Amino acid sequence: RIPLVGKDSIESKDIGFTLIHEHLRVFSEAVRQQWPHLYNEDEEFRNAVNEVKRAMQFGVKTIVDPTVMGIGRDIRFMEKVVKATGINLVAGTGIYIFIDLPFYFLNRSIDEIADLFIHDLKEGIQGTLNKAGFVKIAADEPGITKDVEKVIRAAAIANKETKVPIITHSNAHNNTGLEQQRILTEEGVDPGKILIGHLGDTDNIDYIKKIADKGSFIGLDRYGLDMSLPVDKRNETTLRLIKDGYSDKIMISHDYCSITLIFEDTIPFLKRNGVNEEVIATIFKENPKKFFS
Amino acid sequence: RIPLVGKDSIESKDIGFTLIHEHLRVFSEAVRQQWPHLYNEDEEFRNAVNEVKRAMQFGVKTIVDPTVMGIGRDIRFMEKVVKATGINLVAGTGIYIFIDLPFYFLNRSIDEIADLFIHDLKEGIQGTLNKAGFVKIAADEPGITKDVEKVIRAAAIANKETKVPIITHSNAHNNTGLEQQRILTEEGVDPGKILIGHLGDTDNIDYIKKIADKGSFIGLDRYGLDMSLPVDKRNETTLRLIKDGYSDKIMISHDYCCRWSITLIFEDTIPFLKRNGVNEEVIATIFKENPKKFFS
Ligand SMILES: [Co+2]
Ligand SMILES: [Fe+2]
Ligand SMILES: [Fe+2]
């Protein structure tokens, strides 16, 4: 079912407690490659190994890292951190852009772009046998631009052909994620194979529900890296969302570059307001489980 | 004087017959990093070796390759091909973009950029001892945008700090080339340390000269890419310019390997000029002497 980095495919049912949106490392491939002297491979690798193994202590069995083209996916560093920790790591494919595709994509087709994603998820990633387990796409303040729309559409095709889910990045303040659901569902993707990202950044609880009402998971997924909304206002929308029955559509993560702030703040908090272990299990085991099923 | 790839430095007076703008290889860093199955480095290598050596037989001694960030500069590929051919290859540093910078440069400073250029000139390129002899900037249809502007200034700074010249990519139809000059020159870069590129892509010979008159080299540098102006309209704008005595300001090149190749000018443009009243001194002005002073 779910390919992992380093280890061999697991069954959807054994994903376990999951962090659905976390970055081991992020960069611009062009910058890293032209100017290696800006980066410390050993520091980076130390920091990610410590963060991860802390999370494994707290009960996390699986991290899904949606680092793709444009924010510096490296499957090799990834399998390094797997082998140094024993974590279940799901790598994805896709393209992260907010306006234009790189020049290579001028006069390329939607289908040609999807063949990239299919390659990654059937043959493998950057020449290895580690396979992609989902597709990532993005839009932010610029909105649904032409090239952003191509990428969205190629995700649609990759999902049809392979049935791997799709994770999005979106701007909670400008209707991007609604548009992303609209276009994917229009093209025939199961709404429930979609995670609409970063909705945790707004107070506007109606907009969030609007999306969850159309059958997709809603991403409350930048806890702690809280330049969007204080961790106190997140932990509240989250609670409110749980009280009105949306647990079956809620996913929680950090989007990091700590990875355990939800054990220190959010999960403690939710318990205090009468959220039982069964709803936290729904969010971190069952929702991941079905998303990948 | 001029740092080279796979070889000791050489004097400004020793470049020989130069092609001032030719790319061994060009690709988007993001794409190749993510999807290397799309590229075959073995074919890229044979082609680069072959084309380079064909260029050596028409008596090309030095090639300048303005592949920098955004179009897939790799000095490991360059040095590898330098040893298969024995060319004097001059690598560079700078940024190639037409609108926005990578997310990394968000909130970051003109001097922090300028430092990444100074790094590749003074310390080395991609942590190797091969050093950069010039700085490449670019601008095109989207105009002089905020981030394009920043990259120009960072180039200014690197020219003041190590006095390497600045090659530019510009659009010949919209006055970007003259702004790159203006701004660079405002910042107090010596006009004669600026080659402004791709002016051979236009008829408007009035616009060409203006840039030559303000002291900067003009790049008639896309020979064989017909999609722009055909070879016969190019050779002509070129001829006129020479007959008007713009020789000391003219640089000629193809802008890329491979009837388009790294030697199209030898089989066509040079013979054409020679049967139209252009002597062996005026071409030597263009391919020996103009580079000479550019890198000096
Ligand atoms: Co150019
Ligand atoms: Fe993210
Ligand atoms: Fe070029």
Plain-language structure description:
Chain B: This is Aryldialkylphosphatase. Chain B: Has a low paraoxonase activity. Also active, but with a lower activity, against other organo-phosphorus insecticides such as Dursban, Coumaphos, pNP-butanoate or parathion. Chain B: Co(2+) binds at residues 136, 169, 198. Chain B: Its EC number is 3.1.8.1. The structure is a homodimer. Chain A has helices at 29-34, 41-57, 75-83, 110-122, 146-162, 176-186, 205-213, 231-243, 261-272, 277-291; strands at residues 18-19, 62-65, 88-91, 93-94, 135-138, 166-169, 194-196, 217-220, 250-252. With 293 residues, chain A is an alpha/beta fold. In chain A, strand 7, helix 7 and strand 8 form a beta-alpha-beta unit. The first copy, chain A, is built from 10 helices and 9 strands. The first copy, chain A, has one domain: Metal-dependent hydrolases (TIM Barrel). In chain A, the strands form 2 sheets. Chain A has a 6-stranded parallel sheet with strand order 4-5-6-7-8-9. The radius of gyration of chain A is 18 Å and the shape is globular. Chains A and B meet through helix 1 and helix 4 of A and helix 1 and helix 4 of B. The structure holds cobalt (II) ion (CO) and fe (ii) ion (2 copies). Cobalt (II) ion (CO) is lined by residues 169, 197-198, 255 of chain B.
